[PDB]
């Protein structure tokens, strides 16, 4: 049998993508990190979706992605939304939490 | 106007990030403008088209990550010989933000 790690499906494609990221961002990736591991996992599964011509779950999985990557910004967005609901007394589309999260990420760097 | 509301929202941000926002900075201006658009869309009960809106937000706020995501998507398309949907550029951008920053 062939070890899974030795099934070299798209190994050189993956390496090309990483080189593009490293050149463009002018850094070296941390192959140890959760962010890198999840990036590679995302790419591997995106390859599968592309091969099968599958769409994605546009709204809902964006939420969880941001909750996992930027929990402080994500939860802060929801705290702002809580206050908006309490004062303005209108419903809030969860897309607003996505926008707020993205606007918060740069603030404390 | 929502002046007191805005001040409370900024206080929450400051607490959560354990920082004080410089009120005499582009940082504060950008923040308050975005928040005011959120308020306006909530009050007027106006939905967004999240796919198109996110592409616009990312292009303008995360140009390096977004443009790099598009380069990667083009490589994937050309290698796999399949269509790639615009939403993929969005999801890939969101995975790149924490790599770059
Ligand atoms: Cl965070
Ligand atoms: Cl909703």
From Swiss-Prot, chain A:
Residue ranges the record marks as coiled coil: none
Keyword Transmembrane helix included in the entry's annotation: no
Domain PRD: 6-104
Keywords on record: Activator, Phosphoprotein, Repeat, RNA-binding, Transcription, Transcription regulation
Example of a GO biological process term: positive regulation of DNA-templated transcription
Modified residues (Phosphohistidine): 42
Record's comment on post-translational modification: Phosphorylated by HPr (PtsH) and EII-Glc (PtsG). HPr phosphorylates the PRD 2 domain which has a slight stimulatory effect on GlcT activity, while EII-Glc phosphorylates the PRD 1 domain which inactivates GlcT. The phosphorylation is dependent on the presence or absence of glucose which acts as an inducer of the ptsGHI operon expression. In the presence of glucose the phosphoryl group is transferred from phosphorylated HPr to the sugar via EII-Glc. Under these conditions GlcT is not phosphorylated and binds to the RAT sequence, thus allowing transcription of the ptsGHI operon.
GO molecular function, a single term: RNA binding
Record remark on domains: Composed of 3 domains: an N-terminal RNA-binding domain that prevents transcriptional termination, and two PTS regulation domains, PRD 1 and PRD 2. PRD 1 is the target of negative control exerted by EII-Glc and PRD 2 is the target of HPr.
Self-association and partners: Homodimer. The monomeric form probably also exists but it would be inactive in RNA binding and antitermination.
Cited function: Mediates the positive regulation of the glucose PTS operon (ptsGHI) by functioning as an antiterminator factor of transcription via its interaction with the RNA-antiterminator (RAT) sequence located upstream of the ptsG gene. The RNA-binding domain of GlcT directly binds to the RNA antiterminator (RAT) sequence and prevents transcriptional termination. GlcT binding requires two identical and nearly symmetrical triple base pairings in the RAT sequence.
Family label: Belongs to the transcriptional antiterminator BglG family. GlcT subfamily.
Protein name as it appears in the record: PtsGHI operon antiterminator
Organism: Bacillus subtilis (strain 168)
Location of this fragment in the whole protein: 171 to 273 of 281
Curated annotation (Swiss-Prot), chain B:
Domain of life: Bacteria
Domain PRD: start-end pairs: 1-96
Posttranslational mods: Phosphorylated by HPr (PtsH) and EII-Glc (PtsG). HPr phosphorylates the PRD 2 domain which has a slight stimulatory effect on GlcT activity, while EII-Glc phosphorylates the PRD 1 domain which inactivates GlcT. The phosphorylation is dependent on the presence or absence of glucose which acts as an inducer of the ptsGHI operon expression. In the presence of glucose the phosphoryl group is transferred from phosphorylated HPr to the sugar via EII-Glc. Under these conditions GlcT is not phosphorylated and binds to the RAT sequence, thus allowing transcription of the ptsGHI operon.
GO terms, molecular function: RNA binding
UniProt keyword annotations, A-Z: Activator, Phosphoprotein, Repeat, RNA-binding, Transcription, Transcription regulation
Residues with Phosphohistidine modification: 34
Listed GO biological process terms: positive regulation of DNA-templated transcription
Assembly description: Homodimer. The monomeric form probably also exists but it would be inactive in RNA binding and antitermination.
Description of its domains: Composed of 3 domains: an N-terminal RNA-binding domain that prevents transcriptional termination, and two PTS regulation domains, PRD 1 and PRD 2. PRD 1 is the target of negative control exerted by EII-Glc and PRD 2 is the target of HPr.
General function of this protein: Mediates the positive regulation of the glucose PTS operon (ptsGHI) by functioning as an antiterminator factor of transcription via its interaction with the RNA-antiterminator (RAT) sequence located upstream of the ptsG gene. The RNA-binding domain of GlcT directly binds to the RNA antiterminator (RAT) sequence and prevents transcriptional termination. GlcT binding requires two identical and nearly symmetrical triple base pairings in the RAT sequence.
Similarity comment: Belongs to the transcriptional antiterminator BglG family. GlcT subfamily.
The protein's name: PtsGHI operon antiterminator
UniProt lineage: Bacteria, Bacillati, Bacillota, Bacilli, Bacillales
Gene field: glcT
Residues of the full protein shown: 178 to 273 of 281
